[PDB]
Amino acid sequence: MRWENLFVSGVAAWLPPLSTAQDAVMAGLLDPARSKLRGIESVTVASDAEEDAPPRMAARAARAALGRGDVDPADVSLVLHSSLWFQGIDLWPAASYVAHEAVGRHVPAFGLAQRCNGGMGAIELAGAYLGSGIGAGHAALLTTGDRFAGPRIDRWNSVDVTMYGDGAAALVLSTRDGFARVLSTATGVDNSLEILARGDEPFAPHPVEPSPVADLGTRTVRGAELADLPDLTHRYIDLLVAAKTQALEDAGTAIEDIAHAVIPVSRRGTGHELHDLLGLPDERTSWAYGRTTGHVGAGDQYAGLAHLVENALVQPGDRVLLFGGGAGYTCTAAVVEILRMP
């Protein structure tokens, strides 16, 4: 999709303090070979206190993003809140809490689930909603938020390719103006890969209690066995290349013209990494930042953009690729252009 009138007006992250891989190694929680392989140096870790519940971190992130962009909360016509895991109270609309705390009473709020791609997928849904004339205002607030906890989640081991960080992020879209123009978005998808995110886990009538420790790497092995696909790996590559290709083409841009790619925090640690498939070096991606936070649920792309902007690592005229990816498997990519620094 080529966007004629879509802008990023604000972006921010609210992240708890860093907790080092070295401390996790010394405490016996993380094997040192895995620490070195995955290359994650630290992750963000929240306290157990109610004030660091995911909707609260999200509300804080949202207030900062709105504040950085001079978007009046009364101009927000939609709130989308993406997440991976428990929001702290069940049978309850988290997104309305985020919306109420950061925007107000009279804005429709949805919770969104597209695993790690949530943040990126929400751009397309919200952008479309803003262009439709359904809502009053010119802006949408997009949030992410998670806080991982035992026993179900072991942040250092429960997923093979990454390590989870706690926290929240926010991005404000506008059809009027902002510091960056959204030139394009594109989504690559291959829903056959969903089996890799459930492996042979049975469909249970109720959450299994007490929760065993999640091991998403292991689901992957039994998923691959069950799916029995000749081209399993190619299916991933093809959808990622589709997203990249269409987003760059719809932006009239080439990967050589991309100052920086903000990508999900994940690392194979040998062979080809995502930057190789994207066609740019490590140094032109957000890895140097993301390896200090870990995988902050659905928020890596928002957080990494905030990072670029806060540390004046881009200037007007630069183009940035925002690059998604989540179990499903779905990947939404966007090309933005820096118009001014906030």
Next chain:
Amino acid sequence: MRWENLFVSGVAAWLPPLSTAQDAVMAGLLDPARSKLRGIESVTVASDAEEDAPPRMAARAARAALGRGDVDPADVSLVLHSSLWFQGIDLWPAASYVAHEAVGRHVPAFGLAQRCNGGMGAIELAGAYLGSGIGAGHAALLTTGDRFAGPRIDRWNSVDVTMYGDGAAALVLSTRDGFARVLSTATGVDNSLEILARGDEPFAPHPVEPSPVADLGTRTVRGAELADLPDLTHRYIDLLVAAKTQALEDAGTAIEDIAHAVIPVSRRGTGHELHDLLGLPDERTSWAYGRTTGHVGAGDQYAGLAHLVENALVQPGDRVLLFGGGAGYTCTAAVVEILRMP
């Protein structure tokens, strides 16, 4: 919102067998005073077999709906799957499963959370997406699906105003054509009422285990005490009347020209009900059907519309009000005009 080119192509519900309130009373699960007061005769209850997990019931409801409007799977550009509760496997994209089974590999799929209003709210998000030009394809598949179970959910008691039904429903939207035209949608919302959905339940870092039985009626009582609002009931009335009036006005349709209203399944049983606020007799609402299914997650409006259509209880020219409502609190309403009987 007035829609110039939005149609319902197909609608269907996949529902497990009914289970009577009468039997619940004899099994000691339901107080006879409560059964009498609420007027719900039966609720749909799925087996605990894996083939009745919510995403699988949803896939079947989807295939049924796609077949009824002759929408080619290849023309669906989005899938949205709304739900209230556990989908059977955690840390896993249930929407991609629904998408893969009903539609195919290359369609973006999102899970949606807006409690009981998710099925109606989805119509607005999907309609906007279809009008935006993001996808090739002129159709969207909207699904819902839930299957409630203990210990956490007691379908007969966990919510004061209704009793939960298991099952799934699907509604296929089109910008090209359909048997019904969506004349309008409108959303009323008041996010200050989110507190009524959490009561004084603290944010917990991890789901509480073992699960206590949920009691949403008690959350509403505690939440009202905590909020200390002067105009609690007026806030509900305002947002509901807002959704009704705009939906009606944007459809250019008077209340007395609504052939039927499909509403959420609930009942106060005191002689003042939702139908009174809407300005229609009980007999022109879906209560007679609803009270045999219970509250089928986010699917009451799809399910009720399919019931009307399958039993030829409406005819071309008839305008139907689909009326949402879910904790948040958000309510999306729509006026649909029957064009043909498929």
